[PDB]
Design a protein around this ligand. Structure first.
Ligand code: ADP
Ligand code: ADP
Ligand code: BEF
Ligand code: BEF
Ligand code: BEF
Lengths: 343, 533, 95, 48, 451, 152
């Protein structure tokens, strides 16, 4: 969204994880990555020196009709022809691929086996079974437009690139296709790594957080102070707006003082510090310095300034949380009776 | 030994016992739906055998979504639906009165008044009551066309539950929404012209409805118009995937690889049809999807292509941007046009969503309903649905009528009057008549007493009494104010209800009790072992 | 008690008990093959509960034939077969 | 279908015979079982 | 799930389980080793002394015990005579090597200590070496014959075996080209040894009995083809749009059948052996060529006749060649009484050697070949490796007194290992004496002095 | 027949005119390959009895259905080329002596009731195969474990 201004942003970023390695092994890819392996000696591979990709689409097998196909045989010579003629349609189709000069081919389904041989001596790492709905991402990435049908396969849709990589080193022997680099822009990918698969499905998770946190800044730029600091403010502010409120909404509102105190309390207690301790001392620093930077820092094992210690969270982070817990309580509080029966 | 049959596994709850099992359950469905009426009322969380959770206050919802084995009950549960269909609100009103009225029935039997004699009673009272309801009038068929108060009235209708507290914003959103599809419901075109998308975010407050249908589609190719500016559209429903003539054709190549010509033929036969569309005039929309090839042709011929537009949407798409859902383009374009408004696409709540910023002839519309929990929205849809149906039909029958109990006691006052002439004509049947009133009175008490607990205004005694003393005079006036706990005129207060609604709340009820009192016995033939379990 | 959720068949251990159950579960899969390593170490025989045997001193293959009940133990079995990918030897020791 | 080896000479209920050499190998081990358990017990620096 | 025994507490259960299996083989040794009638499943019932079959049809629960019973066949394949002995040695090898485990420092010091053993012992086992002429092999082939129920006719077999070995006939002789029919009845001395192949194949030519009983100078054609109306390999279907294309098709059938044998008789054939049966039509069209035809011959069988006759098996008769027909002297289908049997022998320089036996019941005969194999094989062992050892347990006692010598001449704590290996080899002859005692023990020290 | 390519005949009387033609095209390819060298043939799918006689008479060692993971490593050392389909460009039969390999000996050895074919010497000198030998499978297998774990 750079140079595009602030906007609600959806992640097109793709993070794929190989179970081999430790956390740190994972790295950003200056280009594209694909989960599918090469054609392997199926077949003859990576990486065509300088490369030119292709988003090949549709079937690739011997010309078969989407209607009833029955090449009946009545004579006694059309055998040779049928078998010879097939080698033609499946050859030409291949020839054109190289004709335009795109180095690589990419087909989702119904491809051909015999045709792989003709491809073998052509130096194109044909890759099959690539995500059926993805073609979108793959395109904007490798800059190569999608190619539907066989006649079109033009030199236009060729993905101007410089190298294709199919590595297998480093635990585990399992390999992944790397593509770099493409002239186009707007697509970024990262490959995760960690043992047990636990660390993958968690290092990955620990990103949809880091990432989303940033799109919180894109969706609504602003940052408060963490360490329960943001929460503490309410205990002070909201409390005053209750004294001069009178009626019954003084105790109800005082309830939001009784409430927000949890975040700092559990935050601090989860470290071993006295929930009473830091809280009390937060009340002071809160009233004294308008809770502007003060809070609880686990590292500091005390009560320093959240901002001073670079402890930052999006303004949406803690604001879109309250709005929920409240509108939620409402729902729950509206409940008076629970009965059961097949919906 | 006897047998004595009859048959085993069957039982005859007869006579008074039948009278019991009959009455004794009708009001069973009372304590269940008692909570729903009154802005001060509360909702119910329903679970099932599939481990699911529903927490909504609608009655058709708490009666259809219930398990019941006493005929009368299921019967009134049945009457609950009748409403939800023919009108948005009043299902809850239909039961509470249905039951309470039937409660007053099992009561006259303490006096020994034959049931047929009470059908006779309730019958007079029933029509005699609806009568005065007709007499109120107050319809805004004529200008001031604005009839904003009536729209305000639906909101008054939807007050309570969860949605009502927030606003006051819904009526404006529904009102406008209906007003677009207003002319639409009159035509027999259902409410399906309005679509509701759950993209939960923020609070049920932030939820809003954007002019110009929203759709969850594309744009399924990168080399495609992210947004279409001013461009015209085309609503279509032809086959793009099967790509087969509607004939029993089986291409058989007696030659060696003649398929190479046929497999290219049909692969081009689509290009021909594809070229008419290229022919006009730009974006394409079509129910049946567009296979990877054909759709990738538009993409290169500068034509944003939108596939898999659900039947609802294609009809909806016709409604907004006035288009014709025409497939055949071999004649194009006689009586075949597709107006449009800029079609910028915008994601909401992490979900892709294309909506048209600019458009014309909006006889339909989508309305997003953000929220806090999936459970919450499920209940907002019902609330919008209820109140959205009310307003809908009210625009079909302009007859208005004041809410808050006014309409009810107005019926009750007018009733007891003829009624207290009812004994005279002819005596005992009168009590039945008189009794009928007690019902419409009682629903109001339930509304505040047992349901309008707070603010602390709830007295069954005082409130009701205030209306009768202060309600005969106000003929259709003096309603209630379950907010402050006073008797205040609704009319100055925006307490406006639909005539159709508050009419049927009785028509149903009256028709229900009648056939129920006709019950002498009731029989059943077991189907499951036991099952006392 | 509780109510919490959800039983039966669904349970949870807390703090100490887990941190222990985890350590026990690890010393388990560990202490079995703690004899293997070192020249002074020996081999073992695993029975296919159908008579069939298999003599081996390899730690990786030996842990595979164990069955690895529990998350903590199987986690080590997973760490084992990682070592072969890095190297090929020392699976017996890494655990 | 068969087969089954009959019983050479019968007797009452059940009884256990033991060829002498075999028994000596077999019973000399039984003996040997309680040996390794009594070894560690004898002497001061031992075990209980 | 289950427990596990570890440490010495288990190390033992491994050893004593080993000794356990050998205990059931002590009787079997050459001298008076008595046959063991072992009833097995399904309904199998065998009887003999051949270790790798007396143990084979004997299942064992324990791991160690399962490793031993494996060495039995692990050995029989390699040489094929050390069946009974290898088990008896392997076992006793641990018994006299056990008390050096606990009293010994470790189980690994004993490992290295065993290498210096097998190395030295194999050496001493080479010192007592004899040279095979390659007639005189009949001298060694006698020994394999001697233990089992072949002694009664030790002579008759030794020849019947070195002869079968003699026919093939390659640097390496594969007994896969040496069939062994086993006819019941007659006399054990009636076990001829044809120089061709014997077949249970009844009166060939199932059409009629016309085909010759036997033919002098037969020119054979062995085929793997079907010799019957071939069906379209490519799934084809017929469409009779005509009115009488039905009769013409019916003809196309009998046609190809004739065209089939037509090009097969061109090789002047007078007898054909087809792996597959032949259609009655093609059974007649060639029958008029006075040529015999036997079908249903086994895949392996038509390979024995492939060397005997001399003709090469060929498919698709169209491309038949003169180098496919063979030269064998005769084919006479003599009846074995009630049951037929087609014999085929002769041909110069022919590898195949089918040695039909005789004697008693099918079971008696079995144990005959069972031990016959021990003979046939024992001669190849000596033929592929022309050198022999001083048997009678002498060779054993030798490496025993030799290692024993190395014992004292060793300075180390692992001395108690080499020792064990030695003491255990003395036991090899031990039973030889114990099987013919009393008594084995006194004679022991006798050999120690002599060696 | 190629699937989907049914065979319905008429009027002939030609069911035989192509029956053999089905086999002919097979042998025609078999010979086309045998005519370039054919000292030893190693397929992965396998040779047929009616197509072995042809590779047999020529005294060409043929192995029915080999390990695909092998014929690769083998061909990589003998300089040969593990051929996939017969056709090489169009139109081609085909085979070229430039496809065959370069070794010294192709002898089928023996190892106790079993025999395997070896391939000694190669154009590129990169071929190694260690054939263990011990008492029982119980050990000969574990001996390999120490191998796979030591080679690494
Ligand atoms: N704003 C209001 N204040 C007091 N009473 C109201 C108000 N709005 C509606 N009522 C009346 O209170 C009752 C309950 O609301 P209702 O429209 O019946 O919801 P539902 O029928 O779906 O349960 C009715 O008699 C109704 O008309
Ligand atoms: N009469 C004998 N005295 C001593 N050793 C013999 C005698 N006969 C054979 N042997 C040797 O002892 C060997 C070991 O026995 P083996 O052949 O394996 O089973 P078995 O002796 O029961 O047939 C051989 O039989 C043979 O080489
Ligand atoms: F029951 Be209503 F819809 F509130
Ligand atoms: F078993 Be070893 F460590 F590979
Ligand atoms: F067992 Be012996 F070799 F016949």
């Amino acid at each position: 969204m750079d140079k595009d201004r602030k906007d609600v942003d959806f992640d097109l970023i793709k993070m794929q994880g190989r179970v081999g390695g430790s956390i740190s092994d994972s790295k950003l890819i200056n280009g594209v990555i694909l989960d599918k392996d090469f054609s392997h000696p199926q077949m003859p591979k990576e990486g065509s020196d300088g490369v030119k990709l292709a988003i090949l689409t549709c079937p690739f097998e011997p010309p078969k009709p989407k209607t009833k196909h029955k090449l009946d045989i009545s004579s006694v010579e059309e055998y040779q022809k049928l078998q010879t003629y097939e080698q033609d349609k499946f050859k030409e189709m291949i020839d054109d691929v190289k004709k335009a000069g795109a180095d690589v081919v990419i087909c989702q389904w119904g491809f051909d086996d015999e045709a792989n041989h003709l491809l073998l001596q052509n130096d194109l790492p044909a890759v099959r079974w690539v995500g059926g709905q993805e073609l979108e991402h793959i395109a904007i990435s490798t800059n190569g437009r999608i190619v539907p049908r066989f006649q079109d396969l033009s030199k236009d849709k060729l993905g101007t690139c410089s190298r294709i990589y199919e590595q297998e080193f480093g635990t585990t022997k399992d390999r992944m296709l790397i593509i770099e680099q493409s002239k186009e822009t707007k697509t970024v990918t990262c490959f995760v790594r960690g043992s047990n698969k636990m660390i993958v499905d968690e290092a990955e998770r620990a990103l949809h957080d880091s990432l989303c946190v940033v799109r919180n800044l894109v969706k609504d730029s602003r940052v408060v102070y963490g360490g329960g600091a943001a929460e503490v403010t309410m205990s002070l502010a909201v409390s005053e707006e209750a004294d001069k409120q009178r009626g019954i909404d003084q105790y109800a509102f005082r309830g939001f003082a009784q409430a927000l105190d949890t975040i700092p309390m559990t935050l601090a207690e989860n470290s071993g510090l006295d929930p009473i301790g830091t809280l009390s001392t937060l009340k002071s620093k809160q009233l004294k310095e308008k809770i502007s930077n003060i809070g609880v820092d686990c590292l500091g094992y005390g009560s320093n300034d959240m901002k001073e210690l670079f402890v930052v969270d999006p303004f949406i982070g803690k604001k879109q949380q309250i709005l929920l817990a409240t509108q939620l309580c409402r729902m729950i509080l509206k409940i008076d009776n629970v009965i059961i029966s097949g919906k | 030994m006897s047998l004595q049959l009859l048959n085993p596994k069957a039982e005859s709850l007869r006579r008074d016992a039948a009278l019991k099992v009959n009455v004794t359950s009708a009001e069973g469905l009372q304590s269940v739906l008692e909570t729903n009426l009154g802005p001060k009322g509360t909702l119910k969380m329903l679970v099932d055998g599939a481990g699911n959770i529903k927490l909504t206050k609608d009655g058709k919802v708490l009666l259809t979504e219930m398990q019941i084995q006493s005929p009368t009950a299921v019967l009134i549960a049945r009457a609950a639906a009748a409403q939800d269909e023919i009108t948005g609100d009043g299902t809850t009103t239909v039961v509470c009165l249905v039951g309470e009225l039937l409660r007053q029935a099992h009561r006259f039997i303490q006096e020994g008044v034959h049931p047929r004699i009470i059908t006779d009673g309730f019958e007079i009272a029933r029509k005699e009551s609806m009568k005065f309801l007709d007499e109120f009038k107050i319809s805004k068929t004529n200008l001031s066309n604005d009839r904003e108060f009536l729209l305000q009235v639906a909101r008054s209708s939807l007050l309570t539950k969860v949605d009502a507290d927030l606003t006051e914003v819904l009526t404006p959103i529904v009102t406008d929404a209906v007003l677009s599809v207003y002319d639409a419901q009159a035509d027999n075109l259902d409410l399906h012209m309005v679509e509701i998308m759950q993209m939960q975010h923020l609070s049920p407050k932030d939820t809003t409805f954007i002019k110009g249908l929203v759709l969850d589609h594309g744009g399924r190719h990168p080399d495609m118009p992210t947004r279409v500016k001013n461009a015209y559209v085309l609503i279509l429903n032809v086959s793009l995937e099967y790509e087969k003539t509607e004939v029993n054709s089986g291409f058989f190549y007696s030659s060696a690889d003649q398929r190479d010509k046929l497999a290219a033929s049909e692969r081009k036969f689509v290009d021909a049809k594809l070229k008419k569309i290229i022919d006009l005039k730009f974006v394409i929309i079509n129910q049946k999807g567009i296979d990877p090839m054909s759709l990738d042709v538009f993409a290169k011929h500068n034509i944003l292509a939108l596939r898999r537009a659900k039947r609802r949407n294609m009809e909806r798409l016709q409604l907004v941007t006035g288009g014709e859902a025409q497939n055949s383009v071999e004649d194009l374009s006689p009586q075949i046009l597709g107006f449009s408004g800029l079609v910028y696409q915008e994601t909401i709540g992490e979900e892709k969503f294309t909506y048209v910023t600019e458009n014309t002839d909006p006889k339909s519309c989508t309305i997003l309903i953000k929220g806090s929990t999936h459970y919450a929205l499920a209940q907002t849809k019902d609330a919008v649905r209820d109140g959205l149906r009310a307003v809908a039909n009210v625009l079909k029958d302009k007859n208005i009528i004041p809410g808050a109990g006014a309409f009810y006691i107005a019926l009750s006052r007018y009733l007891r009057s003829a009624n207290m002439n009812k004994l005279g004509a002819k005596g005992k049947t009168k009590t039945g008549i008189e009794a009928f009133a007690e019902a419409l009175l009682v629903i109001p008490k339930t509304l505040v007493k047992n349901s309008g607990f707070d603010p602390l205004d709830v007295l069954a005694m005082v409130e009701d009494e205030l209306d009768d003393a202060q309600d005969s005079d106000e003929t259709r006036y003096v309603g209630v104010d379950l907010n402050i706990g006073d008797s205040c005129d609704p009319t100055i207060e925006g307490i406006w209800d639909s005539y159709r609604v508050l009419r049927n709340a009785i028509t149903g009820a009256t028709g229900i009790a009648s056939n129920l009192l006709l019950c002498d016995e009731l029989l059943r033939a077991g189907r499951s072992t036991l099952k006392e379990t | 008690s509780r109510s919490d959720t959800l039983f039966l068949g669904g349970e949870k251990i807390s703090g100490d008990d887990i941190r222990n159950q985890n350590v026990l579960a690890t010393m388990a899969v560990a202490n079995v093959v703690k004899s293997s390593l070192g020249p002074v170490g020996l081999d073992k025989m695993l029975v296919d509960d159908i008579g069939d045997f298999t003599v081996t001193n390899d730690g990786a293959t030996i842990l595979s034939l164990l069955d690895v009940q529990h998350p903590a133990g199987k986690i080590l079995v997973e760490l084992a077969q990682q070592q072969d990918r890095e190297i090929g030897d020392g699976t017996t020791s890494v655990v | 279908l068969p087969q089954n080896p009959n019983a050479g000479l019968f007797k009452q209920g059940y009884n256990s015979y033991s060829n002498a050499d075999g028994q000596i190998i077999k019973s000399i081990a039984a003996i040997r079982e309680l040996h390794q358990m009594c070894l560690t017990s004898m002497g001061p620096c031992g075990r209980n | 799930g289950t427990d596990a025994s570890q440490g010495k507490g288990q190390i033992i259960s491994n050893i004593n389980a080993c000794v356990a299996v050998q205990e059931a083989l002590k009787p079997t040794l050459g001298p008076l080793g008595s046959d063991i009638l072992i009833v097995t499943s399904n309904q199998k019932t065998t009887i003999s002394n051949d270790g790798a079959t007396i143990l084979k049809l004997l299942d064992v629960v324990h791991p160690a015990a399962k490793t031993l019973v494996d060495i039995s066949r692990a050995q029989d394949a390699e040489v094929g005579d050390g069946t009974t002995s290898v088990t008896i040695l392997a076992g006793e090898l641990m018994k006299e090597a056990k008390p050096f485990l606990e009293e010994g420092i470790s189980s690994h010091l004993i490992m290295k200590g065993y290498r210096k053993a097998v190395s030295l012992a194999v050496e001493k086992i080479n010192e007592l070496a004899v040279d095979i002429t390659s007639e005189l092999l009949e001298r060694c082939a006698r020994t394999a014959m001697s233990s089992k129920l072949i002694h009664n006719n030790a002579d008759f077999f030794v020849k019947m075996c070195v002869d079968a070995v003699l026919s093939l006939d390659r640097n390496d002789l594969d007994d896969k080209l040496i069939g062994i029919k086993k006819i019941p009845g007659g006399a054990m001395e009636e076990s001829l040894f044809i120089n061709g192949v014997a077949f249970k194949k009844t009166f060939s030519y199932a059409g009629f009995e016309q085909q010759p009983k036997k033919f002098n100078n037969p020119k054979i054609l062995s085929l793997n083809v079907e010799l019957e109306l071939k069906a379209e390999k490519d799934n084809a279907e017929v469409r009779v749009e005509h009115v009488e294309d039905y009769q013409a098709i019916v003809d196309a059938e009998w046609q190809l059948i004739f065209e089939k044998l037509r090009q097969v008789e061109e090789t002047g054939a007078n007898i054909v052996l087809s792996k597959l049966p032949i259609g009655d039509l093609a059974t007649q069209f060639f029958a008029d060529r006075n040529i015999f035809c036997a079908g249903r011959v086994s895949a392996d069988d038509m390979n024995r006749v492939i060397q005997a006759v001399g003709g090469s098996i060929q498919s698709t008769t169209s491309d038949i060649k003169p180098e496919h027909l063979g030269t064998c002297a005769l084919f006479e289908e003599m009846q074995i009484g009630s049951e037929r049997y087609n014999l085929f022998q002769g041909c110069p320089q022919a590898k195949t050697c089918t040695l039909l036996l005789r004697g008693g019941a099918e079971q008696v005969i079995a144990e005959v070949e069972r031990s016959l194999h021990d003979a046939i094989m024992i001669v190849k062992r000596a033929l592929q490796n022309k050198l022999i050892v001083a048997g009678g347990g002498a060779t054993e006692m030798e490496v025993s007194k030799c290692l024993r010598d190395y014992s004292k001449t060793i300075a180390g704590k692992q001395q108690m290992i080499i020792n064990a290996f030695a003491k255990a080899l003395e036991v090899i002859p031990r039973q030889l004496c114990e099987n013919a005692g009393f008594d084995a023990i006194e004679i022991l020290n006798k050999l120690r002095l002599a060696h | 027949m190629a699937m989907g390519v049914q065979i319905n005949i008429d009027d002939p009387e030609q069911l035989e005119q192509i029956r053999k033609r089905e086999a002919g095209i097979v042998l025609e390819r078999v010979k086309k390959i045998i005519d370039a060298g054919a000292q030893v043939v190693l397929t992965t799918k396998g040779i047929d009895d009616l197509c072995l006689k042809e590779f047999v008479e020529a005294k060409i060692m043929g192995v029915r259905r080999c390990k695909k993971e092998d014929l690769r490593r083998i061909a990589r050392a003998t300089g040969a080329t593990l051929v996939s389909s017969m056709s090489n460009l169009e139109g081609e039969e085909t085979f070229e002596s430039s496809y065959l390999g370069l070794c010294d000996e192709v002898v089928q050895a023996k190892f106790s009731d079993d025999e395997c074919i070896l391939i000694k010497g190669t154009s590129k000198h990169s071929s190694s195969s260690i054939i263990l030998r011990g008492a029982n499978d119980y050990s000969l297998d574990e001996m390999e474990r120490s191998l796979h774990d030591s080679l690494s």
